[PDB]
Amino acid sequence: SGAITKGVVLDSTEALCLAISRNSEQMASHSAVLEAGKNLYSFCVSYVDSIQQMRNKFAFREAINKLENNLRELQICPATAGSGPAATQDFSKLLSSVKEISDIVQRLE
Numbered sequence: 001s002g003a004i005t006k007g008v009v010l011d012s013t014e015a016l017c018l019a020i021s022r023n024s025e026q027m028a029s030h031s032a033v034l035e036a037g038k039n040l041y042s043f044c045v046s047y048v049d050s051i052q053q054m055r056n057k058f059a060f061r062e063a064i065n066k067l068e069n070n071l072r073e074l075q076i077c078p079a080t081a082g083s084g085p086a087a088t089q090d091f092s093k094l095l096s097s098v099k100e101i102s103d104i105v106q107r108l109e
Contacts, residue, residue: 004043005050006105012040013098020091030074033094037071044101056108063101070097 001008016036022028044064051057070093073081082088 001043004047006047006102006109009040009043009047009105010102012036012043013102016040017095017098020094023089023091033091034071034074037067037074037094041067041071051108053108056104060101060104060108063097063104066097066100067094070094 016033016039019028019032019036022032023030041064044067045061048057048061048064051060074091074094
């Protein structure tokens, strides 16, 4: 994927975003946005090591962290989320998290 940059990172944030958009086209799979989710957090995390900004790296980086704990709750969990009957499929949070990260890098580098 090159050397892992914001450009590559974006493609990863979008690709997964579509995976979430796929959970409506035909159910798809929660492990799609999740699997792609981890890969993205991975590129970003290894990409922040190039942030020259410094006191601004925290901004973008922390956003990445959000995706970290975002996928975490997105995994499966004991039963807090869905004990069975209640499913609720609105991953708009993953949406706010992604947009945020990008929103920072562009106004950062």
